[PDB]
Write a protein that binds this ligand. Sequence first.
Ligand SMILES: [Zn+2]
Length: 224
Amino acid sequence: RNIEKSKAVTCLSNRENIKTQIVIAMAEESSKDKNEVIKEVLENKDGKYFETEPKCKSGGIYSATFDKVYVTCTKHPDGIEMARDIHQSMKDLIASFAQDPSIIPGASKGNDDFRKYLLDNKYKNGWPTIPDEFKAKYGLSKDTLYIQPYAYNPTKSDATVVVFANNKTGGNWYTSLVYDYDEGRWYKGKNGISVAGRSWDVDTDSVKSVKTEIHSKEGWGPLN
Ligand SMILES: [Zn+2]
């Protein structure tokens, strides 16, 4: 129904509001336990944070963590969490390879082979996808948008990981949606950029890192 989709959109906005209030609350009492800060925001202690305790209309239960602040709902999978999880799985795999080349089977130890490992061993139903409510809110495509990693130089000491989303499950490194892992934000532009063949965040004289580019290219900006 339009009811269920609305519940999903509403919950997303809830989680973003929870995130902002937690962030503000932590900056307020900088020297007090963060889990306790999170608990009071979630429960709307003394009506201080919201008009009422945030509740998911689909009956989900909210959680929030501190690394940067992230919020989840047990009934509404969140695209930022999915991106973070993908980013960390690739980072773990890169660290594992650094101790043991054989963790990737076969002769080829490239980005596609690291991704294949992730698909075979963890994401067995394929890459996770950007939730419809996030797409509706932020003006993204009806197309299924696959949240997925690109590993730059995964066998080397300057390995980096970028998570992005496009309508392909592989073989296309151009994207208009890039997840900036450092900011907790998706970036969107209308002209796609390639995430391949260059570092997430180390610029050279002639080749700007993906991160530099998403923050400086024209038509590019933050979404959430
Ligand atoms: Zn929810």
